[PDB]
mmCIF file of C-alpha atoms in Angstrom:
data_model
loop_
_atom_site.group_PDB
_atom_site.id
_atom_site.type_symbol
_atom_site.label_atom_id
_atom_site.label_comp_id
_atom_site.label_asym_id
_atom_site.label_seq_id
_atom_site.Cartn_x
_atom_site.Cartn_y
_atom_site.Cartn_z
ATOM 1 C CA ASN A 1 -78.450 -19.243 -59.412
ATOM 2 C CA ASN A 2 -79.057 -17.880 -55.965
ATOM 3 C CA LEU A 3 -80.473 -21.205 -54.823
ATOM 4 C CA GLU A 4 -77.207 -21.156 -53.067
ATOM 5 C CA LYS A 5 -78.087 -17.949 -51.137
ATOM 6 C CA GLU A 6 -81.378 -19.363 -50.180
ATOM 7 C CA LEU A 7 -79.739 -22.567 -49.056
ATOM 8 C CA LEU A 8 -77.215 -20.815 -46.682
ATOM 9 C CA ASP A 9 -79.797 -18.430 -45.457
ATOM 10 C CA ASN A 10 -82.035 -21.275 -44.582
ATOM 11 C CA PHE A 11 -79.195 -23.309 -43.011
ATOM 12 C CA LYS A 12 -78.281 -20.177 -40.817
ATOM 13 C CA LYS A 13 -81.820 -19.797 -39.831
ATOM 14 C CA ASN A 14 -82.192 -23.090 -38.717
ATOM 15 C CA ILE A 15 -79.134 -23.263 -36.576
ATOM 16 C CA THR A 16 -80.052 -19.824 -34.894
ATOM 17 C CA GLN A 17 -83.639 -21.365 -34.186
ATOM 18 C CA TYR A 18 -81.905 -24.653 -32.859
ATOM 19 C CA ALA A 19 -79.688 -22.557 -30.782
ATOM 20 C CA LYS A 20 -82.382 -20.376 -29.291
ATOM 21 C CA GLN A 21 -84.469 -23.426 -28.406
ATOM 22 C CA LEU A 22 -81.465 -24.776 -26.591
ATOM 23 C CA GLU A 23 -80.733 -21.536 -24.719
ATOM 24 C CA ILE A 24 -84.548 -21.330 -23.585
ATOM 25 C CA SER A 25 -84.398 -24.921 -22.504
ATOM 26 C CA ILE A 26 -81.283 -24.294 -20.449
ATOM 27 C CA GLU A 27 -83.034 -21.216 -18.819
ATOM 28 C CA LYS A 28 -86.211 -23.502 -18.170
ATOM 29 C CA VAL A 29 -83.800 -25.894 -16.281
ATOM 30 C CA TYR A 30 -83.473 -23.254 -13.618
ATOM 31 C CA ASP A 31 -86.714 -21.102 -13.727
ATOM 32 C CA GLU A 32 -89.335 -24.015 -14.242
ATOM 33 C CA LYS A 33 -87.981 -27.552 -13.947
ATOM 34 C CA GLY A 34 -85.106 -27.136 -11.238
ATOM 35 C CA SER A 35 -82.587 -27.568 -10.165
ATOM 36 C CA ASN A 36 -77.510 -31.657 -11.250
ATOM 37 C CA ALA A 37 -77.740 -28.940 -13.932
ATOM 38 C CA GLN A 38 -74.615 -30.232 -15.666
ATOM 39 C CA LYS A 39 -76.232 -33.486 -16.363
ATOM 40 C CA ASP A 40 -79.505 -31.630 -17.518
ATOM 41 C CA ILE A 41 -77.335 -29.433 -19.823
ATOM 42 C CA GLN A 42 -75.124 -32.535 -21.134
ATOM 43 C CA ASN A 43 -78.383 -34.404 -22.056
ATOM 44 C CA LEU A 44 -79.996 -31.417 -23.845
ATOM 45 C CA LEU A 45 -76.722 -30.858 -25.832
ATOM 46 C CA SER A 46 -76.530 -34.438 -26.884
ATOM 47 C CA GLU A 47 -80.081 -34.422 -27.857
ATOM 48 C CA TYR A 48 -79.563 -31.511 -30.050
ATOM 49 C CA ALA A 49 -76.313 -32.666 -31.483
ATOM 50 C CA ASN A 50 -78.421 -35.525 -33.168
ATOM 51 C CA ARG A 51 -78.810 -33.258 -36.202
ATOM 52 C CA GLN A 52 -76.340 -34.351 -38.990
ATOM 53 C CA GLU A 53 -75.461 -30.723 -39.578
ATOM 54 C CA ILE A 54 -74.247 -30.104 -35.989
ATOM 55 C CA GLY A 55 -70.673 -31.220 -35.490
ATOM 56 C CA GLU A 56 -70.332 -30.331 -31.869
ATOM 57 C CA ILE A 57 -72.092 -28.316 -29.232
ATOM 58 C CA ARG A 58 -70.305 -27.325 -25.910
ATOM 59 C CA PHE A 59 -71.648 -25.405 -23.001
ATOM 60 C CA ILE A 60 -68.866 -23.302 -21.322
ATOM 61 C CA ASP A 61 -69.897 -21.723 -18.010
ATOM 62 C CA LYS A 62 -69.367 -18.236 -16.720
ATOM 63 C CA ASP A 63 -65.892 -19.263 -15.476
ATOM 64 C CA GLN A 64 -65.124 -20.477 -18.875
ATOM 65 C CA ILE A 65 -65.019 -23.981 -17.934
ATOM 66 C CA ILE A 66 -66.400 -26.666 -20.494
ATOM 67 C CA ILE A 67 -68.981 -28.536 -18.717
ATOM 68 C CA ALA A 68 -70.428 -30.356 -21.699
ATOM 69 C CA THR A 69 -69.519 -31.523 -25.059
ATOM 70 C CA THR A 70 -71.112 -33.687 -27.476
ATOM 71 C CA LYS A 71 -68.109 -35.046 -29.000
ATOM 72 C CA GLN A 72 -66.657 -38.355 -27.964
ATOM 73 C CA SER A 73 -62.987 -37.476 -28.661
ATOM 74 C CA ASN A 74 -63.264 -34.121 -26.827
ATOM 75 C CA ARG A 75 -64.652 -35.633 -23.530
ATOM 76 C CA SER A 76 -61.295 -35.008 -22.122
ATOM 77 C CA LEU A 77 -62.007 -31.257 -22.482
ATOM 78 C CA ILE A 78 -64.916 -31.680 -20.100
ATOM 79 C CA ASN A 79 -63.935 -29.804 -16.840
ATOM 80 C CA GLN A 80 -61.058 -27.899 -18.652
ATOM 81 C CA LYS A 81 -61.061 -24.199 -19.490
ATOM 82 C CA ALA A 82 -62.064 -23.036 -22.944
ATOM 83 C CA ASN A 83 -59.146 -21.291 -24.846
ATOM 84 C CA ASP A 84 -61.596 -19.419 -27.114
ATOM 85 C CA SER A 85 -61.935 -15.685 -27.846
ATOM 86 C CA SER A 86 -65.379 -15.862 -29.482
ATOM 87 C CA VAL A 87 -66.533 -17.740 -26.448
ATOM 88 C CA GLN A 88 -65.001 -15.111 -24.065
ATOM 89 C CA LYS A 89 -66.604 -12.169 -25.812
ATOM 90 C CA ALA A 90 -69.974 -13.773 -25.614
ATOM 91 C CA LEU A 91 -69.593 -14.340 -22.013
ATOM 92 C CA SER A 92 -68.297 -10.790 -21.412
ATOM 93 C CA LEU A 93 -70.504 -8.816 -23.860
ATOM 94 C CA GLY A 94 -73.474 -11.010 -23.227
ATOM 95 C CA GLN A 95 -74.443 -11.239 -26.876
ATOM 96 C CA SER A 96 -74.353 -13.949 -29.438
ATOM 97 C CA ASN A 97 -71.893 -13.937 -32.235
ATOM 98 C CA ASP A 98 -70.967 -16.100 -35.173
ATOM 99 C CA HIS A 99 -67.803 -16.680 -37.229
ATOM 100 C CA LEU A 100 -66.242 -19.068 -39.822
ATOM 101 C CA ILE A 101 -63.230 -21.136 -38.882
ATOM 102 C CA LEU A 102 -61.307 -23.711 -40.888
ATOM 103 C CA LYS A 103 -61.106 -27.096 -39.085
ATOM 104 C CA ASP A 104 -59.618 -30.251 -40.161
ATOM 105 C CA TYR A 105 -61.415 -33.071 -38.340
ATOM 106 C CA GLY A 106 -59.206 -35.435 -40.441
ATOM 107 C CA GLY A 107 -60.902 -35.152 -44.007
ATOM 108 C CA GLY A 108 -59.382 -31.901 -44.929
ATOM 109 C CA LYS A 109 -59.814 -28.222 -44.027
ATOM 110 C CA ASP A 110 -63.690 -28.001 -43.765
ATOM 111 C CA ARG A 111 -65.511 -24.724 -43.753
ATOM 112 C CA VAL A 112 -67.217 -24.641 -40.243
ATOM 113 C CA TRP A 113 -69.775 -22.067 -39.132
ATOM 114 C CA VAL A 114 -69.362 -21.288 -35.275
ATOM 115 C CA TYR A 115 -72.336 -19.924 -33.405
ATOM 116 C CA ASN A 116 -72.091 -18.670 -29.776
ATOM 117 C CA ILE A 117 -75.187 -17.918 -27.657
ATOM 118 C CA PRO A 118 -74.824 -16.648 -24.218
ATOM 119 C CA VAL A 119 -77.297 -18.220 -21.631
ATOM 120 C CA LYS A 120 -78.752 -15.637 -19.280
ATOM 121 C CA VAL A 121 -80.918 -16.703 -16.405
ATOM 122 C CA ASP A 122 -82.839 -13.972 -14.441
ATOM 123 C CA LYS A 123 -80.426 -11.437 -15.301
ATOM 124 C CA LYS A 124 -77.275 -13.366 -14.886
ATOM 125 C CA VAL A 125 -74.899 -14.622 -17.700
ATOM 126 C CA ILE A 126 -74.285 -18.145 -16.578
ATOM 127 C CA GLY A 127 -72.627 -19.477 -19.551
ATOM 128 C CA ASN A 128 -72.366 -20.001 -23.305
ATOM 129 C CA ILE A 129 -73.673 -22.510 -25.813
ATOM 130 C CA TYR A 130 -70.909 -22.854 -28.631
ATOM 131 C CA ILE A 131 -72.146 -24.690 -31.716
ATOM 132 C CA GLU A 132 -69.807 -25.890 -34.596
ATOM 133 C CA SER A 133 -72.252 -26.267 -37.748
ATOM 134 C CA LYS A 134 -71.232 -28.100 -40.988
ATOM 135 C CA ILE A 135 -71.807 -25.379 -43.558
ATOM 136 C CA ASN A 136 -69.878 -27.708 -45.809
ATOM 137 C CA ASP A 137 -72.905 -29.846 -46.288
ATOM 138 C CA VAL A 138 -74.709 -26.880 -47.604
ATOM 139 C CA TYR A 139 -72.558 -27.231 -50.758
ATOM 140 C CA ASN A 140 -73.146 -31.018 -50.553
ATOM 141 C CA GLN A 141 -76.798 -30.779 -50.539
ATOM 142 C CA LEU A 142 -76.202 -28.084 -53.139
ATOM 143 C CA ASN B 1 -80.000 -42.211 -0.968
ATOM 144 C CA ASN B 2 -80.026 -41.202 -4.664
ATOM 145 C CA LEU B 3 -77.359 -43.638 -5.395
ATOM 146 C CA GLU B 4 -80.149 -45.294 -7.082
ATOM 147 C CA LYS B 5 -80.843 -42.369 -9.157
ATOM 148 C CA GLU B 6 -77.261 -42.191 -10.253
ATOM 149 C CA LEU B 7 -77.185 -45.768 -11.002
ATOM 150 C CA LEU B 8 -80.221 -45.750 -13.437
ATOM 151 C CA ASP B 9 -78.831 -42.466 -15.038
ATOM 152 C CA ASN B 10 -75.540 -44.112 -15.765
ATOM 153 C CA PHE B 11 -77.226 -47.414 -17.002
ATOM 154 C CA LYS B 12 -79.446 -45.276 -19.386
ATOM 155 C CA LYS B 13 -76.323 -43.250 -20.663
ATOM 156 C CA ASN B 14 -74.377 -46.483 -21.210
ATOM 157 C CA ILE B 15 -77.196 -48.082 -23.295
ATOM 158 C CA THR B 16 -77.662 -44.763 -25.410
ATOM 159 C CA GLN B 17 -73.946 -44.665 -26.068
ATOM 160 C CA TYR B 18 -74.110 -48.320 -27.126
ATOM 161 C CA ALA B 19 -76.872 -47.702 -29.275
ATOM 162 C CA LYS B 20 -75.338 -44.847 -30.992
ATOM 163 C CA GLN B 21 -71.998 -46.632 -31.585
ATOM 164 C CA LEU B 22 -74.072 -49.363 -33.134
ATOM 165 C CA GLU B 23 -76.168 -47.083 -35.350
ATOM 166 C CA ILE B 24 -72.842 -45.265 -36.609
ATOM 167 C CA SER B 25 -71.289 -48.835 -37.236
ATOM 168 C CA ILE B 26 -74.340 -49.764 -39.317
ATOM 169 C CA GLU B 27 -74.106 -46.386 -41.234
ATOM 170 C CA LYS B 28 -70.398 -47.144 -41.848
ATOM 171 C CA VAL B 29 -71.303 -50.704 -43.295
ATOM 172 C CA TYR B 30 -72.728 -48.533 -46.178
ATOM 173 C CA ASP B 31 -70.723 -45.305 -46.203
ATOM 174 C CA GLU B 32 -67.130 -46.773 -45.808
ATOM 175 C CA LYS B 33 -66.886 -50.420 -45.667
ATOM 176 C CA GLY B 34 -69.492 -51.650 -48.082
ATOM 177 C CA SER B 35 -71.591 -53.152 -49.133
ATOM 178 C CA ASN B 36 -74.245 -58.876 -47.569
ATOM 179 C CA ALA B 37 -75.163 -56.095 -45.048
ATOM 180 C CA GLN B 38 -77.600 -58.444 -43.161
ATOM 181 C CA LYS B 39 -74.587 -60.590 -42.210
ATOM 182 C CA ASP B 40 -72.715 -57.450 -41.334
ATOM 183 C CA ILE B 41 -75.681 -56.206 -39.238
ATOM 184 C CA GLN B 42 -76.173 -59.832 -37.533
ATOM 185 C CA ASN B 43 -72.579 -59.815 -36.415
ATOM 186 C CA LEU B 44 -72.539 -56.313 -35.106
ATOM 187 C CA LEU B 45 -75.806 -56.894 -33.081
ATOM 188 C CA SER B 46 -74.582 -60.356 -31.741
ATOM 189 C CA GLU B 47 -71.266 -58.580 -30.760
ATOM 190 C CA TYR B 48 -73.135 -55.625 -28.945
ATOM 191 C CA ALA B 49 -75.355 -58.345 -27.285
ATOM 192 C CA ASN B 50 -72.410 -59.616 -25.266
ATOM 193 C CA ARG B 51 -73.146 -57.187 -22.555
ATOM 194 C CA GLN B 52 -74.816 -59.075 -19.624
ATOM 195 C CA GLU B 53 -77.359 -55.953 -19.243
ATOM 196 C CA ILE B 54 -78.545 -56.244 -22.988
ATOM 197 C CA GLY B 55 -81.283 -58.875 -23.224
ATOM 198 C CA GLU B 56 -82.010 -58.651 -27.045
ATOM 199 C CA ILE B 57 -81.081 -56.508 -29.955
ATOM 200 C CA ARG B 58 -83.034 -56.753 -33.057
ATOM 201 C CA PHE B 59 -82.599 -54.873 -36.446
ATOM 202 C CA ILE B 60 -85.938 -54.218 -38.219
ATOM 203 C CA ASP B 61 -85.638 -52.834 -41.635
ATOM 204 C CA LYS B 62 -87.755 -50.057 -43.152
ATOM 205 C CA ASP B 63 -90.398 -52.575 -44.339
ATOM 206 C CA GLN B 64 -90.583 -53.586 -40.734
ATOM 207 C CA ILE B 65 -88.918 -57.071 -41.453
ATOM 208 C CA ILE B 66 -86.651 -58.340 -38.780
ATOM 209 C CA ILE B 67 -83.520 -59.163 -40.312
ATOM 210 C CA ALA B 68 -81.434 -59.916 -37.304
ATOM 211 C CA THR B 69 -81.805 -60.834 -33.785
ATOM 212 C CA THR B 70 -79.339 -61.822 -31.059
ATOM 213 C CA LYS B 71 -81.715 -64.298 -29.293
ATOM 214 C CA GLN B 72 -81.378 -67.889 -29.709
ATOM 215 C CA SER B 73 -85.146 -68.621 -29.040
ATOM 216 C CA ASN B 74 -86.378 -65.892 -31.389
ATOM 217 C CA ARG B 75 -84.336 -66.809 -34.606
ATOM 218 C CA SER B 76 -87.687 -68.150 -35.780
ATOM 219 C CA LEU B 77 -88.543 -64.260 -35.897
ATOM 220 C CA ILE B 78 -85.940 -63.419 -38.464
ATOM 221 C CA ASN B 79 -87.372 -62.696 -41.831
ATOM 222 C CA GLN B 80 -90.880 -61.982 -40.145
ATOM 223 C CA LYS B 81 -92.702 -58.819 -39.757
ATOM 224 C CA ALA B 82 -92.301 -56.906 -36.362
ATOM 225 C CA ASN B 83 -95.613 -56.454 -34.507
ATOM 226 C CA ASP B 84 -94.335 -53.418 -32.614
ATOM 227 C CA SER B 85 -95.828 -49.694 -32.321
ATOM 228 C CA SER B 86 -92.535 -48.273 -30.835
ATOM 229 C CA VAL B 87 -90.664 -49.884 -33.905
ATOM 230 C CA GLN B 88 -93.193 -48.542 -36.338
ATOM 231 C CA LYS B 89 -92.978 -45.008 -34.787
ATOM 232 C CA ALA B 90 -89.217 -44.707 -34.904
ATOM 233 C CA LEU B 91 -89.255 -45.959 -38.412
ATOM 234 C CA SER B 92 -91.897 -43.414 -39.476
ATOM 235 C CA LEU B 93 -90.948 -40.144 -37.150
ATOM 236 C CA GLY B 94 -87.057 -40.942 -37.818
ATOM 237 C CA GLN B 95 -86.506 -40.352 -34.258
ATOM 238 C CA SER B 96 -85.339 -42.567 -31.210
ATOM 239 C CA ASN B 97 -87.665 -43.502 -28.314
ATOM 240 C CA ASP B 98 -87.577 -45.591 -25.178
ATOM 241 C CA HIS B 99 -90.200 -47.149 -23.009
ATOM 242 C CA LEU B 100 -90.695 -49.609 -20.144
ATOM 243 C CA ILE B 101 -92.477 -52.808 -20.697
ATOM 244 C CA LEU B 102 -93.066 -55.870 -18.576
ATOM 245 C CA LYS B 103 -91.922 -59.118 -20.008
ATOM 246 C CA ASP B 104 -91.659 -62.419 -18.589
ATOM 247 C CA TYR B 105 -88.824 -64.376 -19.986
ATOM 248 C CA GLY B 106 -89.685 -67.184 -17.725
ATOM 249 C CA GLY B 107 -88.452 -65.933 -14.313
ATOM 250 C CA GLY B 108 -91.323 -63.590 -13.531
ATOM 251 C CA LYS B 109 -92.502 -60.276 -14.851
ATOM 252 C CA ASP B 110 -89.319 -58.301 -15.325
ATOM 253 C CA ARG B 111 -88.750 -54.549 -15.664
ATOM 254 C CA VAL B 112 -87.359 -54.192 -19.114
ATOM 255 C CA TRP B 113 -86.224 -50.821 -20.678
ATOM 256 C CA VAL B 114 -86.711 -50.916 -24.533
ATOM 257 C CA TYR B 115 -84.630 -48.369 -26.683
ATOM 258 C CA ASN B 116 -85.370 -47.840 -30.466
ATOM 259 C CA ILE B 117 -82.812 -45.844 -32.577
ATOM 260 C CA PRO B 118 -83.533 -45.524 -36.305
ATOM 261 C CA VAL B 119 -80.638 -46.120 -38.609
ATOM 262 C CA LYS B 120 -80.369 -43.234 -41.154
ATOM 263 C CA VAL B 121 -77.814 -43.519 -43.970
ATOM 264 C CA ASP B 122 -77.187 -40.605 -46.376
ATOM 265 C CA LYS B 123 -80.741 -39.146 -45.817
ATOM 266 C CA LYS B 124 -82.836 -42.410 -45.816
ATOM 267 C CA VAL B 125 -84.221 -44.236 -42.881
ATOM 268 C CA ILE B 126 -83.085 -47.804 -43.648
ATOM 269 C CA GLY B 127 -84.381 -49.314 -40.536
ATOM 270 C CA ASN B 128 -84.437 -49.423 -36.524
ATOM 271 C CA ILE B 129 -82.216 -50.948 -33.772
ATOM 272 C CA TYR B 130 -84.593 -52.237 -31.197
ATOM 273 C CA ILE B 131 -82.785 -52.996 -27.853
ATOM 274 C CA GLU B 132 -84.267 -54.753 -24.524
ATOM 275 C CA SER B 133 -82.003 -53.843 -21.675
ATOM 276 C CA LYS B 134 -82.097 -55.471 -18.166
ATOM 277 C CA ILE B 135 -83.141 -52.574 -15.989
ATOM 278 C CA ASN B 136 -83.793 -55.055 -13.362
ATOM 279 C CA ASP B 137 -79.973 -55.702 -12.523
ATOM 280 C CA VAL B 138 -79.835 -52.026 -11.709
ATOM 281 C CA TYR B 139 -81.713 -52.959 -8.591
ATOM 282 C CA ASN B 140 -79.623 -56.147 -8.362
ATOM 283 C CA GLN B 141 -76.365 -54.178 -8.498
ATOM 284 C CA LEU B 142 -78.109 -51.802 -6.152
#
């Protein structure tokens, strides 16, 4: 019955927990590790991207330039501006948001759950983690 | 100064990217192409082995039998068990690892960077890609 509801909740919870870990790890690049942060960020992102349920992670800085992406095909978007309202809102409001979108990666219009989490280090919004997660597979694992 | 650091990072990045491509290609043998997989695996491995900076690639299956190797001299190790802890750990933990070892291929003890990447197809660890890369030449190209 509502195994479906628990499956989606658990999926949501995992993603949020991933995203928090990634946000803290990026803070820790500054606060503890120091100090080529883009490289440090790209590596962390590409690590986290290794979950099958994550389709893409990007890091968009406070000037809204994309400085890392985990997708092969979008590497050309690195060092470009991000044309995205949910990202601008996170950068501007300094709070997280999530939303569903429809995206055709080439297999059909897929249900994708986007999560944005601003990265705030010592009182400054330095950027935003943008995550596409494959909420589709929740119905596949269902 | 730290041209050295960038050279090693770039070397590491390339190898990781190779290994990911090879892992996906082996998944795609099952998911898309079908269906004499050992032959399919040996060919892919021997293809990828064509980079000068790759010294050997082996594929070790979940039972830890070596089913492909790109080295002439080790062809006798094909269809033998792999006596290797970094391989067992990848198969068991289902995550990638890397490590440095010292290996004398006959020219002296060389610095070799080993990368292991488990191959997971539709939720099963089916095996592990083991790569020896010639981190030595980074200091030669240096």
